[PDB]
């Protein structure tokens, strides 16, 4: 049994670890152009801010699925029941 | 001479050289454009 549980801890670290790596790089690319838009069009920043949140939900779509599955593997491991 | 009025033509001398919140997008470069605008401005004051 130990190899299934030990490899599951690494599966969990890969699910949220790669998600953290991609969302932090993705929000640096996205947020960097938001500050530039706010500097070029200061009176339009309220619109640019609203447009940014539409992309934030799409940028976090697959990453939150990984976080949900990672918590599922830690408190209700679906592999330990497979003998 | 400057056209002060129908009865007055004031002779004058003025120096050609040397001479808000938001900012412009520059194509190709700002320096490239400043060099072009300054010649158009001096040739304009001479025609005036």
UniProtKB/Swiss-Prot annotation, chain A:
Its main location: membrane. GO terms for molecular function: lipid binding; proton-transporting ATP synthase activity, rotational mechanism. Keywords: ATP synthesis, Cell inner membrane, Cell membrane, CF(0), Hydrogen ion transport, Ion transport, Lipid-binding, Membrane, Transmembrane, Transmembrane helix, Transport. Pfam families: ATP-synt_C (PF00137). The record marks 60 as: Reversibly protonated during proton transport. It comes from the Bacteria. It is found in: Cell inner membrane. HAMAP family: ATP_synth_c_bact. Belongs to the ATPase C chain family. F(1)F(0) ATP synthase produces ATP from ADP in the presence of a proton or sodium gradient. F-type ATPases consist of two structural domains, F(1) containing the extramembraneous catalytic core and F(0) containing the membrane proton channel, linked together by a central stalk and a peripheral stalk. During catalysis, ATP synthesis in the catalytic domain of F(1) is coupled via a rotary mechanism of the central stalk subunits to proton translocation. Key component of the F(0) channel; it plays a direct role in translocation across the membrane. A homomeric c-ring of between 10-14 subunits forms the central stalk rotor element with the F(1) delta and epsilon subunits. This is ATP synthase subunit c. It comes from Pseudomonas paraeruginosa (strain DSM 24068 / PA7).
Curated annotation (Swiss-Prot), chain B:
It comes from the Bacteria. It is found in: Cell inner membrane. Belongs to the ATPase gamma chain family. Produces ATP from ADP in the presence of a proton gradient across the membrane. The gamma chain is believed to be important in regulating ATPase activity and the flow of protons through the CF(0) complex. F-type ATPases have 2 components, CF(1) - the catalytic core - and CF(0) - the membrane proton channel. CF(1) has five subunits: alpha(3), beta(3), gamma(1), delta(1), epsilon(1). CF(0) has three main subunits: a, b and c. This is ATP synthase gamma chain. It comes from Pseudomonas paraeruginosa (strain DSM 24068 / PA7). The gene is atpG.
């Amino acid at each position: 049994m130990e190899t299934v549980v030990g490899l599951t801890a690494i599966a969990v670290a890969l699910l949220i670890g790669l998600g953290a790596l991609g969302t932090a790089i993705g929000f640096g690319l996205l947020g960097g152009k938001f500050l530039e838009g706010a500097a070029r069009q200061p009176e339009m920043v309220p619109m640019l801010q609203v447009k940014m949140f539409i992309v934030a939900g799409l940028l976090d779509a697959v990453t939150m699925i990984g976080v949900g599955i990672a918590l599922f593997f830690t408190f209700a491991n679906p592999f330990v029941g497979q003998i | 001479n400057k056209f002060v009025n129908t009865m007055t033509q004031k002779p004058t001398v003025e120096q050609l050289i040397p001479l808000h919140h938001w900012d412009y997008l520059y194509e190709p470069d700002a320096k490239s454009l400043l060099d072009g605008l300054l010649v158009r401005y001096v040739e304009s004051q001479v025609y005036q």
